Design a protein around this ligand. Structure first.
Ligand SMILES: *[C@@H]1O[C@H](CO)[C@@H](O)[C@H](O)[C@H]1NC(C)=O
Ligand SMILES: *[C@@H]1O[C@H](CO)[C@@H](O)[C@H](O)[C@H]1NC(C)=O
Ligand SMILES: *[C@@H]1O[C@H](CO)[C@@H](O)[C@H](O)[C@H]1NC(C)=O
Ligand SMILES: [Cl-]
Ligand SMILES: [Zn+2]
Lengths: 592, 12
């Protein structure tokens, strides 16, 4: 090709080799600290992690010598584009220093936030575990209200003036990088250009999120109405049969998930949940057995075994940081770090983390920067569908953790789907509405004097949730969630959720599965493993739209598979709700 | 933590 393209290819070839060596060495230090926490290693790992962050800055400068307009090879364009990003470099040194100070202060205000007893001002509670325990386990309306209000008053108010200047500085940075605003900048993770038939604009994400949410509304309104009727028995006299759910009664500090409402809403409380923890301890299962069974599951669909380095290097038990994590260091080195316990949860989590490893192994041959998920939602969606198959009674029988004669009754099935929906479906309105608020704020569509007014109009309208006390514009309730005060995009939790049921339905059709989608186990299906692997090996070398089509046969996000997964619960909920109101009036509030 | 990303390659 042309001289500029040839020189770009040569540059990228040298970048990819230099990056592999330094990333392997840098992430090798991360493995030392996270498996052997010492005072030396915190700064020793910083010495390796700072060396890595500066290398990308120098390589970014070198990448700018090759105009993107001259590159015709799309794989080279994709790599140059990721390298040519300026980010906060477009800001003046004063504005970068200010933004970084604001960012660090918001993060610190959140992580040190605490509320104290008004009668005993030295007795204080942190979010974890103190306030979180109240929000999950308290049945005292006023104690829940006190924790919900105090967090937003002590923490959120502190963040309000910081969040205003964060919006200004972030928008200026995004505009200088030729985006419309900071929200438009975040939506760039889904952008696809220059591939005919697979393009995707940044605005299209807003329309696709809003269209798929439209179809979610009937299921969510019926879940909401069922929960609301059950919550009236849990908190008598405090909940209107036609109104929104008071925001402090939802089982965590924000209502991000309804998971902790289960024992207050369980359809058939006498049917216990399927748990194979005891069956595993009885059969003398250890951590080695868990991951070996996980490896057998992936081998069963045509994916490879784990590597010799995996077993040699992975830390599968507490001897460290105990977050379940999958490691992709390069040079054929893959590891899992997990302080495994002999429980059903860790058996499911091990399938999740090895799904990450299978994804990592499949795209290991891609260029350095293309060794990533097709977009921000892909990787966790791949891990989630591994737990879906591994948790079914069907699969638990085949590995001998359920008796061969075990039949799951229809009341136990409804309990499981409802518990699933409280977490999976309950978070979708929350996630879309929060990100919609931020998107509109970044767009300049919500004036500062209406920030909290619009936040709670949108909570009432979209989420069916109402503030138990009025909040003026001294509050910054969004910033009282970690993701907002710590500058993380949120829509990934929406797209990942829809992706995972798109994946599972396609894999289960390929396996020619019979019956309800939620009972499917893709084990021993090489067709499903080949369908999945045709996307896994792409990394992000292809448009995410193409990678999705490789699994499910369509180019776009689709919520119909999620609706299919929950169809048995939807049918049951409509019958439960036949004498209840479905939906809500935004006019009721606990205080007015 | 270190990542194959240019936006957030490093977290301590
Ligand atoms: C782009 O370059 C790569 C090598 O870096 C090559 O394998 C690929 O075929 C090129 N693109 C096209 C469309 O041929
Ligand atoms: C990065 O900034 C430099 C200097 O302002 C500019 O020439 C270059 O085009 C920018 N790169 C991108 C990808 O915007
Ligand atoms: C997969 O096939 C093997 C060999 O027939 C069998 O032992 C195992 O139980 C099967 N697993 C499932 C989930 O069907
Ligand atoms: Cl809130
Ligand atoms: Zn994961």
């Amino acid at each position: 090709q042309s001289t500029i393209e040839e020189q770009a290819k040569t540059f990228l070839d040298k970048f990819n080799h230099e990056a592999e060596d330094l990333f392997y060495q840098s992430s090798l230090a991360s493995w030392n600290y996270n498996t052997n926490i010492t005072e030396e290693n915190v700064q020793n790992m910083n010495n390796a992690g700072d060396k890595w962050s500066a290398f990308l800055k120098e390589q970014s400068t070198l990448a700018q010598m090759y105009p993107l307009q001259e590159i015709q090879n799309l794989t080279v364009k994709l790599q140059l584009q990721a390298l040519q990003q300026n980010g906060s470099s477009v800001l003046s040194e004063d504005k970068s220093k200010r933004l970084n100070t604001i960012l660090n202060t918001m993060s610190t205000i959140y992580s040190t936030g605490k509320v104290c007893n008004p009668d005993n001002p030295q007795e204080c509670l942190l979010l974890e575990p103190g306030l979180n325990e109240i929000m999950a386990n308290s049945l005292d309306y006023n104690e829940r209200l006190w924790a919900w209000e105090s967090w937003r008053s002590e923490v959120g108010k502190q963040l309000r003036p910081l969040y205003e200047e964060y919006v200004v500085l972030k928008n200026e940075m995004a505009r200088a990088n030729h985006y419309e605003d900071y929200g438009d900048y975040w939506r760039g993770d889904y952008e696809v250009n220059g591939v005919d038939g697979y393009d995707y604009s940044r605005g299209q994400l807003i329309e696709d999120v809003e269209h798929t949410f439209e179809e979610i509304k009937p299921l969510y309104e019926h879940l909401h109405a069922y929960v609301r009727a059950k919550l009236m028995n849990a908190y008598p006299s405090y909940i209107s049969p036609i109104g929104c759910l008071p925001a402090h009664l939802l089982g965590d500090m924000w209502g991000r998930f309804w998971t902790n409402l289960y024992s207050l809403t369980v359809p058939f409380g006498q049917k216990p949940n399927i748990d194979v923890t005891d069956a595993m301890v009885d059969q003398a299962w250890d951590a080695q057995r868990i991951f070996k069974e996980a490896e057998k599951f992936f081998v069963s669909v045509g994916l490879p075994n784990m590597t010799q380095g995996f077993w040699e290097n992975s830390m599968l038990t507490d001897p460290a940081v105990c977050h379940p994590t999958a490691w992709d260091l390069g040079k054929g080195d893959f590891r899992i770090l997990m302080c495994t316990k002999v429980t059903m949860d860790d058996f499911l989590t091990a399938h999740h983390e090895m799904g990450h490893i299978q994804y990592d192994m499949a795209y290991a041959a891609q260029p350095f920067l293309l060794r990533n998920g097709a977009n921000e939602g892909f990787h966790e969606a791949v891990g989630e569908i591994m737990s879906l198959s591994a948790a079914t009674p069907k699969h638990l029988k085949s590995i001998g953790l359920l008796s061969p004669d075990f039949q799951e009754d229809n009341e136990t099935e409804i309990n499981f789907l409802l518990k699933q929906a409280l977490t999976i479906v309950g978070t979708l309105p929350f996630t879309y509405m929060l990100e919609k608020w931020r998107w509109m704020v970044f767009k300049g569509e919500i004036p500062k004097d209406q920030w909290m007014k619009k936040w709670w109009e949108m909570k009432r309208e979209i989420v069916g949730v109402v503030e138990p006390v009025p909040h003026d514009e001294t509050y910054c309730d969004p910033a009282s969630l970690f993701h907002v005060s710590n500058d993380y995009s949120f829509i990934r939790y929406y797209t990942r959720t829809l992706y995972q049921f798109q994946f599972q339905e396609a894999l289960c059709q390929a396996a020619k599965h019979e019956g309800p989608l939620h009972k499917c186990d893709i084990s021993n299906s090489t067709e499903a493993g080949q369908k999945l692997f045709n996307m896994l090996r792409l990394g992000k070398s292809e448009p995410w739209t193409l990678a999705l089509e490789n699994v499910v046969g369509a180019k776009n996000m689709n919520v119909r598979p999620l609706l299919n997964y929950f169809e048995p619960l939807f049918t049951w909920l409509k019958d439960q709700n036949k004498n209840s109101f479905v939906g809500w009036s935004t006019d009721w509030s606990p205080y007015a | 933590y270190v990542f194959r990303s240019l936006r957030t390659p490093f977290i301590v």
